[PDB]
Amino acid sequence: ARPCIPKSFGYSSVVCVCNATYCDSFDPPTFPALGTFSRYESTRSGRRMELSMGPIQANHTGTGLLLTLQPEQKFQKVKGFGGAMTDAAALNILALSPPAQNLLLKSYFSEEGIGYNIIRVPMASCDFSIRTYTYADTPDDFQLHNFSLPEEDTKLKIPLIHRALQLAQRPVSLLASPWTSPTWLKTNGAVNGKGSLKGQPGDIYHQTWARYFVKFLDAYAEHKLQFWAVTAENEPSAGLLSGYPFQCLGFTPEHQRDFIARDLGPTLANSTHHNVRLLMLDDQRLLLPHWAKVVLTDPEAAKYVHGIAVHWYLDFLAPAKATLGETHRLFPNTMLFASEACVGSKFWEQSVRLGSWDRGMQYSHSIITNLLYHVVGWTDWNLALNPEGGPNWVRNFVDSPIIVDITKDTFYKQPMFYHLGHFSKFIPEGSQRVGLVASQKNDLDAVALMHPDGSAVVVVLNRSSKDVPLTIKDPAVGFLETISPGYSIHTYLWHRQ
Ligand SMILES: *[C@H]1O[C@H](CO)[C@@H](O)[C@H](O)[C@H]1NC(C)=O
Numbered sequence: 485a486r487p488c489i490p491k492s493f494g495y496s497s498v499v500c501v502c503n504a505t506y507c508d509s510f511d512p513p514t515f516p517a518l519g520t521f522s523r524y525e526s527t528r529s530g531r532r533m534e535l536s537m538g539p540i541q542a543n544h545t546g547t548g549l550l551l552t553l554q555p556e557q558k559f560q561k562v563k564g565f566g567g568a569m570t571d572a573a574a575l576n577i578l579a580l581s582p583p584a585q586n587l588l589l590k591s592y593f594s595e596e597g598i599g600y601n602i603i604r605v606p607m608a609s610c611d612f613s614i615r616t617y618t619y620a621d622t623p624d625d626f627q628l629h630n631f632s633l634p635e636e637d638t639k640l641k642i643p644l645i646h647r648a649l650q651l652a653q654r655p656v657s658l659l660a661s662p663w664t665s666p667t668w669l670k671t672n673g674a675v676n677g678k679g680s681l682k683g684q685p686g687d688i689y690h691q692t693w694a695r696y697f698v699k700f701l702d703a704y705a706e707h708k709l710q711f712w713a714v715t716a717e718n719e720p721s722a723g724l725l726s727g728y729p730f731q732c733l734g735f736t737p738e739h740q741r742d743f744i745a746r747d748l749g750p751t752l753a754n755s756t757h758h759n760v761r762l763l764m765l766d767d768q769r770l771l772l773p774h775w776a777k778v779v780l781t782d783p784e785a786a787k788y789v790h791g792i793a794v795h796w797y798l799d800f801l802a803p804a805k806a807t808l809g810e811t812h813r814l815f816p817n818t819m820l821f822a823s824e825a826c827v828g829s830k831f832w833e834q835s836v837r838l839g840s841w842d843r844g845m846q847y848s849h850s851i852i853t854n855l856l857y858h859v860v861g862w863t864d865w866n867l868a869l870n871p872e873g874g875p876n877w878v879r880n881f882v883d884s885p886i887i888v889d890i891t892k893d894t895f896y897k898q899p900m901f902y903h904l905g906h907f908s909k910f911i912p913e914g915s916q917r918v919g920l921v922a923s924q925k926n927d928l929d930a931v932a933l934m935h936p937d938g939s940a941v942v943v944v945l946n947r948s949s950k951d952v953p954l955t956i957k958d959p960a961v962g963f964l965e966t967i968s969p970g971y972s973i974h975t976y977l978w979h980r981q
Contacts, residue, residue, distance in 0.1 A: 485511050485596070488532040491896070493838035497528045499887070499896035504580070507587035508532065508897070509596040510909075521964050521978040524910070526902045528841040528971035533902055533909075540962045540978060546955035549926045551942070553958045554919025555934060555980070560858050562915045562933065563821060564657060565908035566602025567592070567864030567885070569648075572612035572875050574640035576868040579890035586651075588886060588895055589644070592867065595653040598905030601913060603645055604823060604863050605711075607662040607700050609636075609675075610718070611730035611878045612866055616675045619700065623668040626692045631699040633707075642707050654912060657712035659823065659863065660700065661766055661793075663731035665693050670733070678726045680734035685742035693743075694751035701757045711757070715766035715793050715823060716740055716748060722767075729878045737771075737778035740764060741785045749788030761790035766823055769794040769807040776811045780818060791819035794859070798827040798846045808857035819860045825850060826865035827900075828873070829881035835873030836883050841971060843883055844899030848945045848973055851907050852929045855917055864904065868895065906975045910941050928952055928968055942976045944968050 488508045490498035500508050510533070516522060519540055524533045567573075577585055591597040608618045613636070622630040633642075649656050664675050669689050672679025682689040697714060704711065716735075723734030735743065744764065752758060765775050772792070780786045792811065796802065808820055827843050828835050837843060851862050866884045873880035885901035888894075911933055920932035920942065929945040946952055946968040956964040960980050968974060 485509050488530075488897075490530055495837045495839040495841070497839045497841040497844075497899055498530050499839050499898055500532055501894060501896060502584070502587055502591070503892075503894045504584040507591060509590065509594075512595060516979065518961065518979045518981065521976050523966070524906065524975045526899075526906065526973050527969060533905060538964070538966075540958065540964045542962045544955060544963045546953055546963070546965050548953040548955070549928070550923035550955045550957060551930055552921045552923070553932055553940060553942070553956070554921055555940075555960070557919030559917035560819070560860050562911055562913060562917070563819075563861035564601040564654075564913045565862055565904065565911065566600040566604065566656070567867045568604040568606070568824070569641050569645055570606055570610065570612040570866045571614060571636050571640065572869060573867040573884075574636070574644050575614065575875060576870055576888040576890070577644060578640060579888060580895065581893050584893055584895065586647075588868065589648055589651050591886070591897060591901070593648045593652045593656070598901070598909040599653045599912070600908055601652065601654045601656050602659060602861060602863050603648065603656060604659045604661060605641065605645070606718075607660050608664070609731055610663040611876050613877055614875050615877060616731065618664060618666050620666045620696065623666070626688055628692065628695055628699050631696065631703075633703050637703075638707070642704070642709065645709060658709060659713045659715070660711050661715040661718040661823070662733070663718050664733050665696065669693055675731050677728055677732070678734060679723060679732075680739060681743070685739070685746035690743060690747040691751070694747040697748060698751060698755045698757060701755070701760065705757070711760050713761035713763055713790065715763045716744055717766060719767045719795065721771060737775045740775075741779040741782055744779065744788055745782060745784040749785065753788065762788055763791045763793040763821060763823070764789050766793040767795055768802065769796060769804075770802045772807040773811045773814055776815055776818070780815050789818065791821050791860075793821050793823035795824040796822070796850060797829070798825060798850055799830050804853050804857045808854070808859065812858040820858050822854050822859050822862040824863060824865050826882040826884075828883040835880045836869065836871055836887055838871070838887060838896055839899065840883070841899050844903040845945065845947050845971075847900045848903040848906060848943070849929055849947060851904075852931050852943065852945060855931045855933075862907070903973060906943055906973050910943075910975045910977060912936065915941065926952065928954075938980055940976075940978050940980055944974045944976070946970060946972050
């Protein structure tokens with residue numbers, strides 16, 4: 485319905501400019517007949533999830549790369565896609581006028597947008613907060629009588645999450661993760677730095693920390709919000725690092741194992757929130773398979789663990805096969821889930837680069853890689869940031885797909901936004917990854933999935949400068965003849981029946 489209004493800021497591509505009365509959006513989805521495909525295209529040259537259609541033919545006119553769907557080769561089912569309602573994101577969104585806020589929320593959660601169905605929610609403060617605080621700062625309160633939700637929750641995060649669910653295309657799943665406990669539960673008595681919980685799994689410290697998880701859930705429940713899942717701690721390895729700058733809580737794999745087995749597992753199970761899933765790790769995949777081996781080979785811990793949550797900071801390179809692949813092999817019945825990704829901390833690089841095509845490609849290349857190694861979901865970090873990558877109480881170092889400029893009541897939708905949407909829009913919960921076979925060595929990245937209703941969705945990413953002529957074969961339908969232009973991403977959809 486409404487096209488991107490482009491704007492360059494000097495980087496390789498454009499942002500799309502939205503404001504109180506205008507934002508780019510889609511029409512409702514339309515279901516073309518068997519023999520017709522839909523293609524959505526984004527390009528570094530400026531196209532933004534532009535729709536076209538064409539035929540799937542019985543004859544084959546391409547002589548280059550062929551990608552053959554193999555619908556009978558079945559892999560993981562998809563949980564979903566989303567991002568984090570941090571203090572910083574809530575603050576930025578609420579800094580726009582109400583009509584602009586709604587266009588931002590629709591861009592992410594609406595069928596007029598890209599269909600998010602996951603929100604990660606920090607349990608109290610992180611670096612993307614404008615202060616350090618927790619839910620129970622009154623010291624030596626072991627029964628957590630003074631546990632309460634501050635304004636950040638009751639005024640910023642919660643009302644914005646209700647509004648997102650109201651707008652939402654699909655059921656949305658909430659995920660919670662803590663950065664720090666009350667410092668009076670910590671070896672180091674500090675919000676950050678090298679410090680873990682005091683004492684031993686089973687003691688009053690470990691039992692109070694677990695009670696906190698339930699207290700959190702009770703409070704959101706009062707606010708009529710329920711969680712799909714919680715993580716056992718955000719990046720537990722960080723809090724073992726001397727002088728780590730942000731809110732953390734250190735756990736060795738062994739400590740997490742025993743904390744889950746002795747404390748968090750039982751406490752959750754004995755509560756009215758026993759249906760909430762528990763995910764372990766919530767940290768870099770570089771810590772796999774080791775971290776999985778340690779926790780999941782103890783039946784006492786394993787009974788409480790539904791999945792393994794992973795992060796990747798994308799400016800790096802950690803091999804997927806040895807980590808995700810091998811972890812799947814060793815524990816094929818415990819789901820992998822990407823719970824946090826972000827980019828831009830290269831000290832020589834701007835935290836926000838408005839219009840960076842590279843950062844976009846980094847998003848989609850990662851999602852493809854994830855999906856190719858059994859990951860069932862992918863969650864972005866901050867939903868929105870200001871143009872400096874903030875607010876952040878320690879230091880700005882990362883980008884966000886939506887950058888908010890409050891002095892102009894405008895927000896910019898980055899290439900990252902559209903690289904994400906090529907997946908989130910077109911891969912509903914319960915879609916299953918299926919085979920897609922390359923006829924020859926090639927420069928593309930691609931992934932095929934089958935919707936719950938049986939239809940096909942294929943994403944093709946070209947991170948090269950050169951156009952790649954391409955045929956996609958569906959055995960039940962025929963040959964789809966196309967070209968993957970240099971620096972483009974396409975999502976193809978077609979009925980198979
Ligand atoms: C959004 O608002 C601006 C200035 O307030 C208005 O002139 C403009 O047409 C809108 N955005 C666009 C380019 O549609």
